[PDB]
Design a protein around this motif. Structure first.
Motif, PDB file in Angstrom:
ATOM      1  N   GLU A  42      53.740  14.336   3.543  1.00  0.00           N
ATOM      2  CA  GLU A  42      53.063  15.067   2.432  1.00  0.00           C
ATOM      3  C   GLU A  42      53.275  16.577   2.579  1.00  0.00           C
ATOM      4  O   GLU A  42      52.442  17.281   3.117  1.00  0.00           O
ATOM      5  CB  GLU A  42      51.583  14.715   2.572  1.00  0.00           C
ATOM      6  CG  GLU A  42      51.136  13.900   1.356  1.00  0.00           C
ATOM      7  CD  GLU A  42      51.033  14.819   0.136  1.00  0.00           C
ATOM      8  OE1 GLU A  42      52.069  15.223  -0.365  1.00  0.00           O
ATOM      9  OE2 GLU A  42      49.920  15.103  -0.275  1.00  0.00           O
ATOM     10  N   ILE A  44      52.852  20.109   2.551  1.00  0.00           N
ATOM     11  CA  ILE A  44      51.686  20.932   2.137  1.00  0.00           C
ATOM     12  C   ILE A  44      52.192  22.264   1.618  1.00  0.00           C
ATOM     13  O   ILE A  44      51.680  22.829   0.672  1.00  0.00           O
ATOM     14  CB  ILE A  44      50.892  21.149   3.418  1.00  0.00           C
ATOM     15  CG1 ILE A  44      50.758  19.828   4.166  1.00  0.00           C
ATOM     16  CG2 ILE A  44      49.514  21.700   3.071  1.00  0.00           C
ATOM     17  CD1 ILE A  44      49.889  20.027   5.409  1.00  0.00           C
ATOM     18  N   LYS A  54      54.079  20.060   6.391  1.00  0.00           N
ATOM     19  CA  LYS A  54      53.979  18.747   5.689  1.00  0.00           C
ATOM     20  C   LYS A  54      53.088  17.790   6.478  1.00  0.00           C
ATOM     21  O   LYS A  54      53.172  17.696   7.686  1.00  0.00           O
ATOM     22  CB  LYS A  54      55.407  18.195   5.586  1.00  0.00           C
ATOM     23  CG  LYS A  54      56.436  19.332   5.613  1.00  0.00           C
ATOM     24  CD  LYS A  54      56.676  19.770   7.060  1.00  0.00           C
ATOM     25  CE  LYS A  54      58.052  19.284   7.519  1.00  0.00           C
ATOM     26  NZ  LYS A  54      57.843  18.813   8.917  1.00  0.00           N
ATOM     27  N   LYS A  55      52.230  17.080   5.800  1.00  0.00           N
ATOM     28  CA  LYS A  55      51.322  16.129   6.504  1.00  0.00           C
ATOM     29  C   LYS A  55      52.060  14.824   6.817  1.00  0.00           C
ATOM     30  O   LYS A  55      52.191  13.956   5.977  1.00  0.00           O
ATOM     31  CB  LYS A  55      50.175  15.880   5.521  1.00  0.00           C
ATOM     32  CG  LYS A  55      49.263  14.779   6.066  1.00  0.00           C
ATOM     33  CD  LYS A  55      48.413  14.215   4.926  1.00  0.00           C
ATOM     34  CE  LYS A  55      47.155  13.562   5.504  1.00  0.00           C
ATOM     35  NZ  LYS A  55      46.107  13.769   4.464  1.00  0.00           N
ATOM     36  N   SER A  57      52.424  11.157   8.402  1.00  0.00           N
ATOM     37  CA  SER A  57      51.485  10.081   8.829  1.00  0.00           C
ATOM     38  C   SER A  57      52.158   9.168   9.857  1.00  0.00           C
ATOM     39  O   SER A  57      53.347   8.925   9.802  1.00  0.00           O
ATOM     40  CB  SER A  57      51.168   9.307   7.550  1.00  0.00           C
ATOM     41  OG  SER A  57      52.272   9.394   6.660  1.00  0.00           O
ATOM     42  N   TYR A  66      48.220  10.662  12.378  1.00  0.00           N
ATOM     43  CA  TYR A  66      49.068  11.572  11.559  1.00  0.00           C
ATOM     44  C   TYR A  66      48.949  13.004  12.078  1.00  0.00           C
ATOM     45  O   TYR A  66      48.390  13.249  13.128  1.00  0.00           O
ATOM     46  CB  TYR A  66      48.516  11.469  10.136  1.00  0.00           C
ATOM     47  CG  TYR A  66      47.020  11.675  10.153  1.00  0.00           C
ATOM     48  CD1 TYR A  66      46.492  12.968  10.255  1.00  0.00           C
ATOM     49  CD2 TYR A  66      46.160  10.574  10.064  1.00  0.00           C
ATOM     50  CE1 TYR A  66      45.106  13.159  10.268  1.00  0.00           C
ATOM     51  CE2 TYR A  66      44.773  10.765  10.078  1.00  0.00           C
ATOM     52  CZ  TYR A  66      44.246  12.058  10.179  1.00  0.00           C
ATOM     53  OH  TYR A  66      42.879  12.247  10.192  1.00  0.00           O
ATOM     54  N   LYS A  68      49.884  17.574  10.971  1.00  0.00           N
ATOM     55  CA  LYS A  68      50.490  18.541  10.016  1.00  0.00           C
ATOM     56  C   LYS A  68      51.905  18.896  10.474  1.00  0.00           C
ATOM     57  O   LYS A  68      52.873  18.642   9.787  1.00  0.00           O
ATOM     58  CB  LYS A  68      49.584  19.772  10.067  1.00  0.00           C
ATOM     59  CG  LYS A  68      48.465  19.631   9.033  1.00  0.00           C
ATOM     60  CD  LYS A  68      47.649  18.371   9.330  1.00  0.00           C
ATOM     61  CE  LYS A  68      46.159  18.675   9.156  1.00  0.00           C
ATOM     62  NZ  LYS A  68      45.826  18.185   7.788  1.00  0.00           N
ATOM     63  N   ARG A  70      54.481  21.945  11.644  1.00  0.00           N
ATOM     64  CA  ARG A  70      55.167  22.915  10.748  1.00  0.00           C
ATOM     65  C   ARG A  70      56.638  23.001  11.148  1.00  0.00           C
ATOM     66  O   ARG A  70      56.980  22.849  12.303  1.00  0.00           O
ATOM     67  CB  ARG A  70      54.457  24.249  10.985  1.00  0.00           C
ATOM     68  CG  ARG A  70      55.341  25.398  10.493  1.00  0.00           C
ATOM     69  CD  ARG A  70      54.646  26.731  10.777  1.00  0.00           C
ATOM     70  NE  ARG A  70      54.630  27.440   9.467  1.00  0.00           N
ATOM     71  CZ  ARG A  70      53.993  28.572   9.347  1.00  0.00           C
ATOM     72  NH1 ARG A  70      54.064  29.464  10.296  1.00  0.00           N
ATOM     73  NH2 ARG A  70      53.284  28.812   8.278  1.00  0.00           N
ATOM     74  N   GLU A  87      48.687  21.251  13.468  1.00  0.00           N
ATOM     75  CA  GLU A  87      47.380  20.577  13.217  1.00  0.00           C
ATOM     76  C   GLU A  87      47.480  19.091  13.572  1.00  0.00           C
ATOM     77  O   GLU A  87      47.620  18.244  12.713  1.00  0.00           O
ATOM     78  CB  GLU A  87      47.114  20.763  11.724  1.00  0.00           C
ATOM     79  CG  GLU A  87      45.699  21.308  11.522  1.00  0.00           C
ATOM     80  CD  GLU A  87      45.642  22.115  10.224  1.00  0.00           C
ATOM     81  OE1 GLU A  87      46.255  23.169  10.178  1.00  0.00           O
ATOM     82  OE2 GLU A  87      44.987  21.667   9.298  1.00  0.00           O
TER      83      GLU A  87
END
Length: 159
Positions: A42, A44, A54-55, A57, A66, A68, A70, A87
């Motif tokens: 995902e 971001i 992007k997230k 999973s 999952y 984050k 970078r 994250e």
């Protein structure tokens, strides 16, 4: 300093077609040719370039899987795609961080060579149990093999 877990392998697939698939469509092929590595992606922020967020999973059963993560330094010309972890479920600030690096290079042998470098930042009295490390090397190798297998399972000609 932190920990390091870099590696590299060879492939008969071209470094260009392999790069785009592992870079331009990597986040999209991860959950496709590797349902045991990443479940979905995902974005971001960023367009997949360096510093993009992007997230991602992960197909697991634990409470947090999952993350984050970078991007670090992407290169659609020098075959360079690195991404850091920021994250993460367990990660709260910047401890136990992870900075990976991917580099593909085609060779005059009918294939190319990929080099994946990984880093593990630790702090306080915590550390990095090889377990999560041994699981990352097994999954990382399955990702490079999942793409190589696909490209080889293509069908553009009959005889």
């Amino acid at each position: 300093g932190v920990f390091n877990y870099e590696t590299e392998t060879t492939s008969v697939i071209p470094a260009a077609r392999l790069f785009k698939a592992f870079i331009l469509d990597g986040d999209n092929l991860f959950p496709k040719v590797a349902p045991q590595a990443i479940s979905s992606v995902e974005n971001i922020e960023g367009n997949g370039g360096p510093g993009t967020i992007k997230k991602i999973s992960f197909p697991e059963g634990f409470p947090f899987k999952y993350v984050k993560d970078r991007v670090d330094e992407v290169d659609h010309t020098n075959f360079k795609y690195n991404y850091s972890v920021i994250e993460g479920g367990p990660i709260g600030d910047t401890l136990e961080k992870i900075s990976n690096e991917i580099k593909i290079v085609a060779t005059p042998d009918g294939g190319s060579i990929l080099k994946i470098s990984n880093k593990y930042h630790t702090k306080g009295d915590h550390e990095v149990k090889a377990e999560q490390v041994k699981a990352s090397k097994e999954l990382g190798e399955t990702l490079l093999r999942a793409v190589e297998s696909y490209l080889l399972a293509h069908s553009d000609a009959y005889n």
